[PDB]
Amino acid sequence: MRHRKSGRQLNRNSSHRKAMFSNMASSLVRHEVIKTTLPKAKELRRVVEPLITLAKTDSVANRRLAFARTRDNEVVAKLFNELGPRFAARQGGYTRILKAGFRAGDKAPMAYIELVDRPA
Amino acid sequence: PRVKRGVQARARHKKVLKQAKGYYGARSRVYRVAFQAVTKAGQYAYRDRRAKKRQFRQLWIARINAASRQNGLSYSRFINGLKKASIEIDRKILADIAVFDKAAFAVLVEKAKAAL
Amino acid sequence: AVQKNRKTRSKRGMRRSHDALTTAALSVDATSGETHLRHNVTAEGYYRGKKVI
Amino acid sequence: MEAIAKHNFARISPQKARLVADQIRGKSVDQALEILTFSNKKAAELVKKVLESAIANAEHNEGADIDDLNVAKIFVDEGPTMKRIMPRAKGRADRILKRSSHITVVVADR
Amino acid sequence: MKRTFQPTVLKRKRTHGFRARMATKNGRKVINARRAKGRARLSK
RNA sequence: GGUUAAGUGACUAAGCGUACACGGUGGAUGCCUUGGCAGUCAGAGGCGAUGAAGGACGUAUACUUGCGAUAAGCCCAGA
RNA sequence: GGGGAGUGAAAUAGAACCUGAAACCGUGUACGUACAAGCAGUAGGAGCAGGCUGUCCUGUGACUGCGUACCUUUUGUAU
RNA sequence: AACCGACUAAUGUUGAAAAAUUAGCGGAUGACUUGUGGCUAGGGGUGAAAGGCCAAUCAAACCUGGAGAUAGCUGGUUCU
RNA sequence: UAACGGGGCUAAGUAGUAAACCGAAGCUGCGGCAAUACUAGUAUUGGGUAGGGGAGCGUUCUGUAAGCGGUUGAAGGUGUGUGGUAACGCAUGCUGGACGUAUCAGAAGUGCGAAUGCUGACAUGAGUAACGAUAAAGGGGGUGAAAAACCUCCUCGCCGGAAGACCAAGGGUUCCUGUCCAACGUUAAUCGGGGCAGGGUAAGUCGACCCCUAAGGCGAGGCCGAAAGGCGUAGUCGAU
Questions:
Q1: Measuring CA to CA, how many Å separate A51 from each of A31, A46, A86, A119, D31?
Q2: Angle of helix A38-54 relative to helix A14-31, nearest 10 degrees?
Q3: E4: nearest nucleotide, CA–C1' criterion
């Protein structure tokens, strides 16, 4: 029935989804703009935007939390050194999804997702 | 000598197919179904050439009855009247008169009434 | 399990009466004048008049 | 002025291609081109190539302008079928038909 | 599952080879038959 | 003329049918035949250790045909 | 893959190649068809559309009557 | 455990598979199991015996021939 | 409903009387055809399975025919018109591009809807099921006409007494490189065990060959057997 339920299965196990989103967040922090399928973009917001919020308060605790959720030291550094400071004032909506047609191979609805206020 | 059947075989099939123009589906396209169809059409056509003669006479009688009863006589009494008056106008004509010359029909009815 | 009578072309056609395709919602970008799927970026990277890619 | 492009022996089922042909039949060339551009159909890409060849043919082989052009006639005809064999279970083999299609587009300034 | 054809070359030759066919009367009958039929391959 | 009422009622075709036109597919038919079939009259009625039948592998500036390290040939005589 | 150009007597003789049937699949046009029940026709029949010029021809066929394929095998088959 | 096997169930039954998969199951230094090569051949072989097996075939293999066996049976049998 | 065919009926029921009418491919009328008798007319007759009998149509081939028709368009194909009781005939537009064939005879591989017929083609189911282990992907970049699938980088996951590395067998160029992407590849493919071309396999010591023999095979003479052969000595082969 799925009444009032949240979270897409994305035709995946939980452990896979968790892995996939951890990866995808790392990619988005690293490149600041990522092309994915639109449903994955929409889910990614629920993963990335909380990491950015965490990164607004710099602490050994919070860095370790971010590390736990990303397992990437380059990402954690960029989060706490760059992205947190950037989005300090901003109250949510750190990312932006731009729909971008279909993928050639499977005509999957695709979208760009990017950080807001990219210096580029 | 060896005889190939093609050219004549096709002509037979085509003859039937041409007779089955206008039938639905297979019955106009496919020889096996068309043949059956063209046969039953011939059967019906034989039966109906007979039954046409019955249907038309029923129609006339129905019309003559209408007209006679408008002129105050039953079909059954009108035919007897005419017979007794020695009037030998067919139902096909009577029914034509009942439609196209209502006055004449009334005359015939008046003649019929007198004979009864 | 299986048909007892081959289906006519008519009835086959009747089934495919709903098989027709519908077109995409398009729009034209203000700046680039490029047609695009409405709500989607253009091929040149515009969305609602701004270069976003 | 008429120009006709054909794509003979196109690897696409006529039934599939015909759905896209139905989308652009009677349409202007500019309108047809956008309809095919934002199609997700394989058929739309084959058909778009034919339509473009037809437009080219009218501009070059005739004297015409893309502006004054309509999909005058479009049709897909059954091409030859490559037969192939698919193994099924219990040693049974089924035939696969690889249908092909002949796509014809005609464009006309009228 | 183990299927019936479990080839070894040696067993193919010793059974169906030319020198095997030629060794026996009835084998030679086979070679002659195949040679008469026009068979490109007389032996395995 | 308008309003109202009553009666009546075309114009829809998602699709489908029939007919026609023009096509596609397909490869029938017709015409054709460098192949067969049945004979007649002749020939020759065997080939093989002087290594056959049939092959393998080669051979010219893949396969078929020919040839055999003298390898699509060498010699000789006629034509 | 095609369109021109060119070749050819012919290119819907263009190598997927003489002729090019049927099944089967399309596009176009006319007519019918969304209150109507069944071997799909038949006898009748309005309307519409083309011709020809309306007691004509062609196509379609609202509506009405009638009407349970074929073969085989059987005492007997819509079966 | 490997390896050999095949007791139960579910799936599968136009299979992934003309006998399997998954979970369990038996044997597991022996009358064990396995490779290579040998031998036995059709009223014949071989069988710790099920008419089992002898190339996905077995109360008499497969191929070719007799051979167009025979078929008081079934089907079918073509223009007016 | 469902024991009038229905509606419905108190007569539209039942019995009767009178005079009507409807009603069949019956009878009659009118036109036509045929069979058989008779003398062209009469008269009778013309449902039909198994089956008997009679008369024909058309096809291929031979003569007729070195004739006749044909590139000024044959056969075949496809329309149309027309004729006959029918099989079918004739004419003709278009297509087609070289044969056809009167008449009268002659001879048959002489007529197909069926045989769970045979061969090919093409339908229906249906754009349906499925796309072959639920070990799993995500992203950046590249090349390209095009990238979910190829290359590359960073992450993730899976096997690890194997899903790694070797060898024998078996296969046979699948190996490597360049190139191509039609078909093949259950999608696409720039990729491939696919196509195409070129290249690549180096031994005193590995293996084979070789020496040796096992089971067993063959087997000079031999023994035995209608023939074919069987068995077997000396031998000679035969690896695992």
A1: 16, 9, 13, 19, 47
A2: 70
A3: H55
